[PDB]
Design a protein around this ligand. Structure first.
Ligand SMILES: *[C@@H]1O[C@H](CO)[C@@H](O)[C@H](O)[C@H]1NC(C)=O
Ligand SMILES: *[C@@H]1O[C@H](CO)[C@@H](O)[C@H](O)[C@H]1NC(C)=O
Lengths: 40, 50
């Protein structure tokens, strides 16, 4: 019961203007999420 | 999705995740065919007051 959406564009610190993100996936996983982190 | 109408080819630029389209009455206006993903317009069969 989880969603991912995304968008990806070239640019000229977050840039101004408008973005609409298409869904990549719905994942039927039902996982309890309260916390997150990023891989580098 | 049961219904009755004229099915046609259509130019509607369905994004790869979109499966069907709606008119403002919530009535379905187009469908992607599930066996081969062509975008079909749906129009009511020809009608009018007599
Ligand atoms: C998720 O787990 C926390 C404890 O780790 C709990 O407080 C929370 O109620 C859980 N989420 C849901 C939707 O119950
Ligand atoms: C469904 O079956 C037909 C005939 O075998 C095939 O041409 C078509 O590509 C199939 N579509 C899907 C979504 O698998």
């Amino acid at each position: 019961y989880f969603k991912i959406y995304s968008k990806h564009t070239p640019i000229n610190d977050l840039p101004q203007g408008f973005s609409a993100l298409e869904p990549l996936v719905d994942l039927p996983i039902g996982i309890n999420i309260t916390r997150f982190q990023t891989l580098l | 999705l049961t219904g009755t109408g004229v099915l046609t080819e259509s130019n509607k630029k369905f994004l790869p995740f979109q499966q069907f389209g709606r008119d403002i009455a919530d009535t379905t206006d187009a469908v992607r065919d599930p066996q081969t993903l062509e975008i079909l317009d749906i129009t009511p069969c020809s009608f009018g007051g007599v």
